[PDB]
Amino acid sequence: ITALRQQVETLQGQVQRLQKAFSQYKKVELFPNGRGVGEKIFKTGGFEKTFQDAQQVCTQAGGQMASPRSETENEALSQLVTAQNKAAFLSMTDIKTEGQFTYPTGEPLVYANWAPGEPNNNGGSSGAENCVEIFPNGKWNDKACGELRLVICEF
Amino acid sequence: ITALRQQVETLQGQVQRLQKAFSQYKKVELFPNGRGVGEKIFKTGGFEKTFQDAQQVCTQAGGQMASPRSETENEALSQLVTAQNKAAFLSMTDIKTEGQFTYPTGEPLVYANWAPGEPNNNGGSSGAENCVEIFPNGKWNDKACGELRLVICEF
């Protein structure tokens, strides 16, 4: 029918405006504590927690901790860490097998950006160092999971 | 026609992607200062104001102060109060009739979570206590409306 055609063209307009409005509100939301990379979105809570606290926080929020699988994804996190001037915990650990860092899924790294001479598993008073922190410069450093670091969740 | 069918199937795809993208951006927005319960959304501004200031703030923002009508809704607020480590004002008062706390609409409570021995209307120097604050543990305490408390708005 011809009226059905009218309803469809109306929907096209409505959908177009929804798309425009949403694109704008994506940018607004991400400023300043969020970064979009691919279909991923990293966002910092602005606070610091231990690794396991941060892991619960991100999960409770409906996401997970950041698993940067590329340089572009790693760069985004670097920007958040820089803006906050606080090193942040990544999602990876080598708790299962020492020396081998893994994603929460069980699969080994497909990307890495260790700083000079890392990891080393030397946390001093803290003891072992099974988690990973990322610096403002984007470099990685294994660190005692019990330390407090910037919380960044991946959605 | 057959072309109209094509336009419709195109809209289905567009709408599906809008839905997926929006679900993701809902989670992103709510982290970390927001909680979704039913069709309600609680969000903290992170700051503290008197009851009447908080009431103007929430209204100006297009919402209202939190009227937790269930344990699930009350729990959500508890999580926000805990994260901020700041007690927050609820929307209810007994200003009209002493002893009887009411929603901004005029209707009496359909849910309550008073702490041991509350309310008591004893604010000391503050005087009377006609408003309600909620603790990190989720318990309620009547308090002088003139006090500064965490602002949480309901949308």
Place this chain on the structure above:
Amino acid sequence: ITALRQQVETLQGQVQRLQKAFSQYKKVELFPNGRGVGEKIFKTGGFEKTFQDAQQVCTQAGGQMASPRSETENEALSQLVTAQNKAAFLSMTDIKTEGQFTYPTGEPLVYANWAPGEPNNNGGSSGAENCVEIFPNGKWNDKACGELRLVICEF
């Protein structure tokens, strides 16, 4: 066909709910650091940077610095500056031609709200004053671009 009609009516419902949900999530996002005026959206990052830093920040985020072209737009910014209690940089400068303040595009002001006796180009130790800051009261004051001021981006 009749089934196509069913799919279309289904889309209408889906779109209606998307619209409702989005309207709600617009209000949530804007609280408390955002203001909507027309098709524009102002949002503060909460931090302070020099004019050129703020300009990079806003651009990187996919927007620009605030170009208030009316009293309603200026009022919105005033509300953000007030809430933060921090004067903010606007997008306008007179760097090209002294005395004549311009938008980033190259066009002269279509609106202005200078405070008593401004601008004056007297920044003391700072030197010249080619940028513009806005006070909680909404009034404008030219200021050394090298100063640190509240960052507010326009999307």
